[PDB]
Symmetry: D2
Subunit: 359 residues, 4 copies
């Protein structure tokens, strides 16, 4: 029996989460995507959105539409290689969602609207058992980063969890290696050079909570505060209060880069750090941390499924000769694609643990 | 008397109408902007928005804020050249706006929410005498294009009017000159190569009424239907049914161009046409239709106050040799800025006529 | 027996011809790419250029490098799928190139420096038998557009040919269908909304032969004259003097669109034209002309192998109701990719004809 | 009375220096621009380039062109406010270029091809006295940064100087303040998020000396090594070997930002640093170092003539609370505008010291 999954919110992440599932052959074997929800039930429009993607190209699998019953006016069901997905109408309140009627057990919460634990807990009243919030959460939801602290998931305690942010998923693997291998981090500040996102504006618009963020996205460099570096504190508790950073939002539609500057806890060298990151990526961080030693630019990381892709040449070439403590590490991430894979990874991990906890 | 103006909507459209008015030296002298009405009343934010523009640069005057009474916590009044503008909270119904109490006679309706004549007529109940919709209108509002048909304004009959669209304001002066000068138009098709706008999306997103328009704006050429060419029929009734057109939305934040292809009603030449357009711009179309014979690109038309800037070189170089009927005309427009000045021009024209009708 | 091919010029144009050749699975079996010629001999850089593409993604074939003889300083040979490719140095005169010694029969002339029939004829003195200029040519070189007039190729007369331009390859199939299906073309004007190209400038630069062309490419709409519509008169001689046009260069890195406005030679309808275009694309224009009836934007045509992709929705929605003569047709092209495959198609066609004519 | 100056390399940098030479209102009175030189001598083309700027808008002074002698085909003399400027033809070698015959002492070297001191010394043999390289130099030329070490100019020992790079001119004022205020700098790493430049490519192209730098500029984040931070160690000798950095080239046409992370030599706070930068900006650094406490984005710094504009909000919000040593400072620069004003500022400073000590 496949894991019965519902996706609440069918946008960049919702759809990329679905692409990941499909491409890795999980659909209908490991995971059953029972339903997807967005603004309407117009399956033809959902199919169009899945089929064509400015950044990630044409969806390579056929998407067709059909009716759940003849009593329905328009197609409300997606069909992907025989797999049927009901398109359900959005709700203001998660507890009204028919998860129980649908047999959905795991909900991927990707609207951006229910990041408060109490809000997301709505899904549990609707019949679901577990919720993965595809973003930082508030209200004490356990935060899990695949490859860093995901084994801290506890089936009997953790029902609404957060998969953190794409940025935290790039940074945390790096910091994890530094901490685990005994380099340590005394202090660190991160800058992410970040592609614009759905929240931004095409031309100067209205943004009362984020004045800079209201300015035209694809013509400016736009600074922002970010919780990503501080969030590593919750995932790697020893780093609590030692890390913060900021974002510069720049005119690319996808792919971002972390520029971490930090002080190590012991004498080391960039060469030693470089060697450790490469080893980690070949071993205990495989599939999470990758690396390159080629002359790559942002377009070259499109569709990379790793959380963090360490840039060896950028890092080795741009550090201080002979330096023992104060270093810069550069790492890339396809902010849509790697993160979406991590959501799927996390659901799979949770289901495995839930199964085990039964007996 | 300085005419008493209120602006409903102080998003980008209302903002730029205000900035154009100020640029013309009109604030506190010819026009009393009494109030702006909007979701937010944070004058500080409004002042920030006026002060800095990604496209149009720095505002020529200083903007400060103050309080309407010592009681208010956050500044709720804008000040420019000594002139106070109250920031008023938006109302669900225009009927409920305090235009009567504020002594506002003319309302610039820029929200895009009240483009139906009967909806905009609510301002009249609110206390206003006249409404200019800064967009195409429905429900029978008289449409007026400065330099083309504005003299059709009838003070006793027209209380809710439309200034049409920026595109119609580019195209109509061209068609007007072709008809007035005896070339005639048998049939025409227009293409506008158009900067992206606020209605578009940074990344691929939901756009139920415009699928193409949901796609990432700054990395796509995005076709669209448009009403601009058909609308010319309403200001030049003899072209009714002879014109239509489309748009290609492209990754520039401002400035657009009309590419008009048409059949003349008599044998002529592109040289005759070129000469007529130039003659008209220097005379009866002065301030509305301009022209260039220089090697200009879109950036060169930023902050141009004219409705239409005929590209003599692009036109003369790209027509068929010896052709007598089938022609292309190229004309530019700062889609934000010319239109803003036209909204002001129209209010001023209506005001002069209203007063002439009374005294 | 596979044909022996050399690529004069291995810039972006030459590169993509090669990738297209591999994509069709012709390397080794149908075509032998014996050598490339460039100012550069470095092969490692070539492999890097071949491996990563900002627009077209990652090359699906593994590229390694090696030496032709252990005597040479650095690698001078590319290895794709076990197939070896020599890198030779550029010559002042094409007569000096060693095609005869290399055993190369067919040369793809993609430098742009030997656009004249006489200059490109040097390749024949260098031991080659046929030349394909991957650009418009002068000096009376035969211009061949696949699916339009390629059967006009004559093995004993035509030894140096042109594959025209990417824009001509988009427009010509459209005009060809209009002519062959009996609609005809009395007059037409074409506008291409064109992605920026290598010849353009990142920031306002120097471009003495094209003043507008020197301006910042990714932030301007930039008009240009073009020869593409005129060149259709060479391919479809009945249209000589009936067609011209222009382009607007816009801020996208690849994919362009033709906007053709024309008067038919008989009374017809947009519905009749739409049906003919679709019928043609399924039959005698298969692989050259395609169509969509979906809500597509420029990204959706990336990596499309067709010369011309007719946009049925954009065409049907944006024509004049009940019109019998004056029509607009919209058609897309990946300006790099469709054309690259056509260069390869032409070579294959010339090969098989040369084979038959020798028999 | 006026300084006899000749701009060599009337490209981007050459022109903007010239515009700064006029913007300050000193053409004719204090500085006499004798001659400019690019490759062509089309005054008409030069005037067009000067009139229209994609980034900086319309030039505020009217430009005309005339002939110097009736014997030559087209004009070769520019006229700005009555002041006449000749357009001499470039030489491949600076020594062949006739500066003495023209009577030019101060030459602004802005071709970018004569960055070697020995090669740039040719200007002297050609008949000129003083040279200012508008870029970093190699071979032992004296590097001067306005507001930092410009008073180290030695009128008898320094003939071919360097105004550094725009990035160095942003970073140096910051570090200078840190050093002079007693904060100290133990170690520093700098990242510049840099607008693309003329050396970059519209689409993937050939860049043998920088593989990443050949990739399409307006659609990629492109990392690069830089010398700007190391160059500061040369201009502020107490920091030699203690600073380095890198850049990320992003899709904006102008304006850049320095992200400096450093370790102070003793206990301080971000509040003390912030207060110090503000004070310095108002005092000893006035006109070189500016600051903002507003919510600005890159477009807002277009036309700012300061070398470095410290971002107070971005700095104060994105540091670690109660930290005493490890800090991030964010400072902006119009990489075109500020630097051009400094080139003018330097020549003028050199002018006085040359005629007070050596005269
Ligand atoms: N995009 C990224 O790079 C990225 C990376 C990591 C995490 N995230 C997080 O993922 C979440 C989604 O981000 P996104 O980029 O996909 O945004 P998005 O806007 O593309 O997706 C949100 C979708 O939710 C739909 N929606 C809105 N209200 C709904 C409702 N009530 N019920 C169901 N659907 C509703 C919207 O119509 C839209 O399609 C956010 O919390 C974001 O912070 C995004």
């Amino acid at each position: 029996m496949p894991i019965k999954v519902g996706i609440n919110g069918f946008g960049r992440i919702g759809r990329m989460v679905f692409q990941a599932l499909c491409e890795d052959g999980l659909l209908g074997t490991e995971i059953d995507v029972v339903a997807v929800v967005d603004m309407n039930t117009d399956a033809e429009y959902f199919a169009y959105q899945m089929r064509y993607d400015t950044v990630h190209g044409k969806f390579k699998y056929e998407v067709t539409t059909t009716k759940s019953s003849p009593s329905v006016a328009k197609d409300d069901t997606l069909v992907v290689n025989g797999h049927r997905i009901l398109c359900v109408k959005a709700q203001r309140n998660p507890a009204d969602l028919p998860w129980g009627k649908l047999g959905v057990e795991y909900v991927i919460e990707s609207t951006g609207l229910f990041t408060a634990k109490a809000a997301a807990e709505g899904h549990l009243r609707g019949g679901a058992r577990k919720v993965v919030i595809s973003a930082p959460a508030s209200g004490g939801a356990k935060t899990l980063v695949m490859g860093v602290n995901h084994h801290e998931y506890n089936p009997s305690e953790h029902h609404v969890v957060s998969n953190a942010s794409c940025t935290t998923n790039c940074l945390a693997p790096i910091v994890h290696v530094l901490v685990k291998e005994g380099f340590g981090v005394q202090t660190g500040l991160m800058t992410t050079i970040h592609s614009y996102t759905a929240t931004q504006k095409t031309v100067d618009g209205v943004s009362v909570k984020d004045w800079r963020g209201g300015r035209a996205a694809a013509v400016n460099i736009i600074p922002s505060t970010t919780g990503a570096a501080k969030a590593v504190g919750m995932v790697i508790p020893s780093t609590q209060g030692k890390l913060t950073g900021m974002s510069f939002r720049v005119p690319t539609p996808d792919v971002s880069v972390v520029d971490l500057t930090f002080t190590a806890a012991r004498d080391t060298s960039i060469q030693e750090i470089d060697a450790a990151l490469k080893r980690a990526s070949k071993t205990y961080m495989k599939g999470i941390l990758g690396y390159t030693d080629e002359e790559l630019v942002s377009a070259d990381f499109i569709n990379d499924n790793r959380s963090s892709i360490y840039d060896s040449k950028a890092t080795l070439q741009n550090n201080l000769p002979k330096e023992r403590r104060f270093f810069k590490i550069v790492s890339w991430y396809d902010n849509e694609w790697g993160y979406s894979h991590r959501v799927v990874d996390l659901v799979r991990h949770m289901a495995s643990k839930d199964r085990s906890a039964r007996l």
